[PDB]
């Protein structure tokens, strides 16, 4: 607030520093969101051109962001308990209820990663092997933000396809994360974003 | 869309750092995504701890991402060669003509001479 | 001390007599910063505050 920052600036100018200091005009910090779903099923690929990630982004519901932010539901919950929590009051499909991977720009952040891949469920052990790197790519992408370097909130990121290289190792050891960041930014930009 | 941006983060040049594998990337991309990987993320090659070379986020006598000796635009479009030991990056043909004819491995006026085998490809 | 006055209040002589913060392409204006905010929160809205007394808040 104004009084809080006035006290901080008075303590900066009079106590911890004797330096004359220019102060800019106050502004706020914004966030980035979406309104309508991704009209184009956007995708990207690794620098070793074998893995191909196709993912679309759509906005969440009304109470979901404040339910995550007030820690009503957590990633430390049971998968069945989390699926029941989604299914009873949000009417989600149980396939979609078991599809939830990660939350937000941080822990209990207001974004939801959902993995819905039918041709990539035949190598779902390899999908679970690359799932953690997909998670840190999602955390980095929603923490940074492509629009004006602000946080991203109230977005469900729905994975459509994951062409994972069979036993990637050398290419699946750090190239997955910036690919996932580019996937998150490209899926966010194709879904009419708002401040 | 050009090659002047970072390879991994797909962002423009702000605080770039080079590597001994021939690829220069963002310092935040090299720090967070290769904190314990120990390998070059451009092609999966092994990268040492001292193999990375800093190129920005400090004081330079050129003031831009240009040739430090030739004082011309040694950007991603131009053939740019960087000194591995010194950290200065110039145009490849200008540094080759300087260090070939008059053996001018130094700067234009700072006069920092070195060997001719420390030049590597930046990108 | 700031050489600025409310129209109801008195006026005095001045006491003491490029910035990129004043760049017009980086400043969002919705409400203009009037004199009253520079008096009520004088360390916030004023560059170089000297011999400034903090006012009493709400009672």
């Amino acid at each position: 607030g104004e009084l809080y920052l006035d006290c901080v600036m008075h303590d900066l100018r009079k106590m911890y520093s004797e330096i004359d200091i220019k102060v800019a005009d106050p502004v706020v910090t914004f966030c980035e969101t979406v309104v309508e779903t991704s009209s184009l099923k956007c995708f990207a690929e690794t620098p070793n051109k074998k893995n191909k990630i196709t993912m679309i982004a759509e906005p969440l519901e009304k109470g979901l962001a404040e339910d995550i932010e007030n820690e009503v539901v957590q990633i430390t919950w049971n998968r069945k308990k989390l699926g029941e929590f989604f299914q009873t009051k949000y009417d989600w499909d149980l396939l979609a209820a078991r599809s939830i991977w990660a939350f937000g720009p941080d822990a209990t952040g207001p974004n939801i990663l959902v993995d819905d891949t039918l041709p990539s469920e035949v190598d779902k052990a390899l999908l679970g092997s690359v799932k953690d790197s997909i998670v840190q790519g999602f955390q980095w992408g929603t923490r940074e933000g492509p629009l004006c370097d602000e946080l991203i909130r109230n977005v469900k990121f729905k994975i459509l396809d994951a062409v994972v290289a069979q036993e990637p190792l050398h290419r699946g050891g750090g190239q997955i994360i910036p690919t996932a960041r580019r996937v998150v930014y490209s899926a966010f930009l194709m879904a009419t974003p708002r401040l | 869309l050009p090659f002047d941006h970072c390879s991994l983060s797909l962002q423009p040049f702000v605080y770039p750092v080079c590597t001994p594998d021939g690829i220069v990337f963002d310092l935040l991309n090299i720090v967070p995504w290769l904190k314990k990987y120990g390998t070059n993320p451009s092609n999966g090659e092994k990268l040492d701890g001292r193999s990375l070379i800093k190129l920005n986020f400090s004081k330079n006598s050129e003031g831009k991402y240009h040739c430090p000796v030739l004082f011309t635009v040694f950007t991603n479009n131009t053939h740019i060669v960087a000194v591995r030991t010194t950290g200065n990056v110039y145009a490849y043909e200008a540094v080759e003509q300087l260090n070939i004819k008059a053996k001018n491995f130094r700067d234009l006026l700072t006069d920092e001479p070195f060997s001719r085998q420390d030049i590597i490809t930046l990108q | 001390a700031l050489n600025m006055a409310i129209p109801g209040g008195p006026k005095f002589e001045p006491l003491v007599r490029w910035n990129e913060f004043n760049d017009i392409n980086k400043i969002i204006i919705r409400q203009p910063i009037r004199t009253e905010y520079k008096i009520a929160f004088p360390y916030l809205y004023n560059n170089l505050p000297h011999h400034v007394h903090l006012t009493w808040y709400h009672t």
């Binding site: 956007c42 004006c148 370097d149 930014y185 | - | 392409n25 980086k26 969002i28």
Partner: peptide, 28 residues
Amino acid sequence: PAPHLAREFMIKTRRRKGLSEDVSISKF
């Protein structure tokens, strides 16, 4: 006015910290 507000906040924030131009297909 109201329809120009998000464009103004976008342009002024990007001039404050980053780059002015924004490309929708800047990654792909």
